[PDB]
């Protein structure tokens, strides 16, 4: 069956880094855009990181760039997001999502921040 | 030619209108003939959270009618950064969100 796995969260202290780990089945890394949202107490779920097909073409929300990175196995099908410089309003559970039909859903992380 | 856009840009899809996104993605000729079909499609292409799969030309340096531009190679605006993002150059492509 088509799912998504995420593993490497954690609790991280002040300024410290991360990597998490998502992981496809079912269909290759290149085929379609992966996303990254982050979800934390307030309004509603945020978007956070987006990468498209032909080349890299990061592309960064202004509160959030320049400070996170993103990295593909392409020979394993899987996208790794590195954490660096992380304060405490960070906090949230965070979800990455691909679209192959209908809109999958992650079960996603919490990460804190203290 | 099918596409995706917001609501206010179907007025700029016309022949002889202007419009920022209009003369950077899609300019319909001026002797143009034909038609647009435009239907709202909140319940298929609107993602609690922000959808961000589609994308549009935001800076780019003209462009002829039915030309395609699949090439999105950064856009100087004036020291050249020589293909690094940074100062006096943008990345040319922005998300409808």
Same mark, same amino acid.
């Given at each position: 069956?088509?799912?998504?796995? /995420?593993?490497?969260?954690?609790?991280? %202290? =002040?300024? @410290?880094?991360? $990597?998490?780990?998502? !992981? +496809?089945?079912?269909?290759?890394?290149?085929? /379609?855009?992966?996303?990254?949202?982050? %979800? =934390?107490? @307030?309004?509603? $779920?945020?978007?956070? !990181? +987006?990468?498209?097909?032909?080349?890299?073409?990061?592309?960064?929300?202004?509160?959030?760039?320049?400070?996170?990175?993103?990295?593909?196995?392409? !020979?394993?099908?899987?996208?790794?997001?590195?954490?660096?410089?992380?304060?405490?309003?960070?906090?949230?559970?965070?979800?990455?999502?691909?679209?192959?039909?209908?809109?999958?859903?992650?079960?996603?992380?919490?990460?804190?921040?203290? | 030619?099918?596409?995706?856009?917001?609501?206010?840009?179907?007025?700029?899809?016309?022949?002889?209108?202007?419009?920022?996104?209009?003369?950077?993605?899609?300019?319909?000729?001026?002797?143009?003939?034909?038609?647009?079909?435009?239907?709202?499609?909140?319940?298929?292409?609107?993602?609690?959270?922000?959808?961000?799969?589609?994308?549009?030309?935001?800076?780019?340096?003209?462009?002829?009618?039915?030309?395609?531009?699949?090439?999105?190679?950064?856009?100087?605006?004036?020291?050249?950064?020589?293909?690094?993002?940074?100062?006096?150059?943008?990345?040319?492509?922005?998300?409808?969100?």
């Amino acid at each position: 069956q088509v799912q998504l796995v /995420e593993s490497g969260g954690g609790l991280v %202290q =002040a300024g @410290g880094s991360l $990597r998490l780990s998502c !992981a +496809a089945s079912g269909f290759p890394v290149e085929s /379609e855009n992966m996303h990254w949202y982050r %979800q =934390a107490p @307030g309004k509603e $779920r945020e978007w956070v !990181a +987006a990468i498209y097909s032909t080349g890299g073409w990061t592309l960064y929300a202004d509160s959030v760039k320049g400070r996170f990175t993103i990295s593909r196995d392409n !020979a394993k099908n899987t996208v790794y997001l590195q954490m660096n410089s992380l304060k405490p309003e960070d906090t949230a559970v965070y979800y990455c999502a691909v679209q192959v039909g209908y809109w999958y859903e992650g079960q996603g992380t919490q990460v804190t921040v203290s | 030619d099918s596409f995706v856009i917001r609501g206010d840009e179907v007025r700029q899809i016309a022949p002889g209108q202007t419009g920022k996104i209009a003369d950077y993605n899609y300019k319909l000729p001026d002797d143009f003939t034909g038609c647009v079909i435009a239907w709202n499609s909140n319940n298929l292409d609107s993602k609690v959270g922000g959808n961000y799969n589609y994308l549009y030309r935001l800076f780019r340096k003209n462009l002829k009618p039915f030309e395609r531009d699949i090439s999105t190679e950064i856009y100087q605006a004036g020291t050249p950064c020589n293909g690094v993002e940074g100062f006096n150059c943008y990345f040319p492509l922005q998300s409808y969100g």
